[PDB]
């Protein structure tokens, strides 16, 4: 997991951001993605799972955004680390809560 | 194709379709819970194509990961006829091309 938010990638998921794409899953307006990321490294927010492409999934324990397909609030984020930095995508809670045997 | 996958791809493809994409297909392996995404281009692949596909899979899994655990992708330079690309299974995006 990287240490710096890539603002251009993260902004796709922030309403009103210059990079925002309407329809995508969105972080809540009061959510600072760099503070969330700093909290992953400080141990405040645990990595609980991995998704496709080995992306960590973090349980922040309180609402961080909403899913674009379900419209539902979520406490979970998928962590995408690339060469230009990190962005957090709100994850459908069913992605975490519907667990295969 | 299952409806969840057409929904997820519809949203994830917002903002990443450019004029050199001819066709995007998805192959869903339900027992393996695996997705294969193929991006057929009218030019050789570039690194930005691979970045865009990684972004797309992150979004798609964040929305639809209850249905799949892993995914792979391929970016393919295709000069095959419009008729041929029109008939490939699993299309979630297909450019208008003259027949």
Residue numbers in the entry:
A (entry chain B): 323 to 423
B (entry chain A): 5 to 103
Structure paper excerpt:
The Maf polymorphic toxin system is involved in conflict between strains found in pathogenic Neisseria species such as Neisseria meningitidis and Neisseria gonorrhoeae. In the MGIs, the MafB and MafI encode toxin and immunity proteins, respectively. Since MafB contains a specific domain (MafB-CT) in the C-terminal region that has toxic activity, a gene encoding an immunity protein, MafI, is necessary to protect MafB-producing cells from the toxic activity. MafB2MGI-2B16B6 is a polymorphic toxin present in MGI-2 in N. meningitidis strain B16B6 and it has been shown that MafB2-CTMGI-2B16B6 has toxic activity.
In order to infer the enzymatic properties contributing the toxic activity of MafB2MGI-2B16B6, which is the second MafB protein encoded in maf genomic island 2 (MGI-2) from N. meningitidis B16B6, the X-ray crystal structure of the complex between the toxin domain of MafB2MGI-2B16B6, hereafter referred to as NmMafB2-CT, and the corresponding immunity protein, MafI2MGI-2B16B6, hereafter referred to as NmMafI2, was determined at 1.5 Å resolution with 18.0% Rwork and 20.8% Rfree using a single anomalous dispersion method. However, the N-terminal 53 residues from Ala270 to Ser322 of NmMafB2-CT were invisible probably due to the degradation of NmMafB2-CT during crystallization. The overall structure of NmMafB2-CT2 has a kidney-like shape characterized by an RNase A fold and consists of two central β-sheets with three peripheral α-helices. The structure of NmMafI2 consists of a four-stranded central β-sheet, one strand (β4′) of which is relatively short, and three helices. In the structure of the NmMafB2-CT2/NmMafI2 complex, the α2′ helix flanked by α1′ of NmMafI2 packs tightly against the shallow groove of NmMafB2-CT2. The interaction between NmMafB2-CT2 and NmMafI2 is mediated by extensive hydrophobic and hydrogen bond interactions including eight salt bridges. Notably, the residues in α2′ of NmMafI2 contributes approximately 65% of the hydrogen bond and salt bridge interactions. Upon complex formation, approximately 1110 Å2 of the binding interface becomes buried, which corresponds to approximately 17.0% and 17.5% of the surface areas of NmMafB2-CT2 and NmMafI2, respectively. All negatively charged residues of NmMafI2 in the complex interface contribute to salt-bridge interactions with NmMafB2-CT2, except that Glu74 of NmMafI2 forms hydrogen bonds with NmMafB2-CT2. These results indicate that complementary charge interactions are the main driving force for the formation of the complex between NmMafB2-CT2 and NmMafI2, and that NmMafI2 functions as an inhibitory regulator protein by blocking RNA from accessing the enzymatic cleavage site because it binds the substrate binding site of NmMafB2-CT2. The dissociation constant of the NmMafB2-CT2/NmMafI2 complex was measured to be ~ 40 nM.
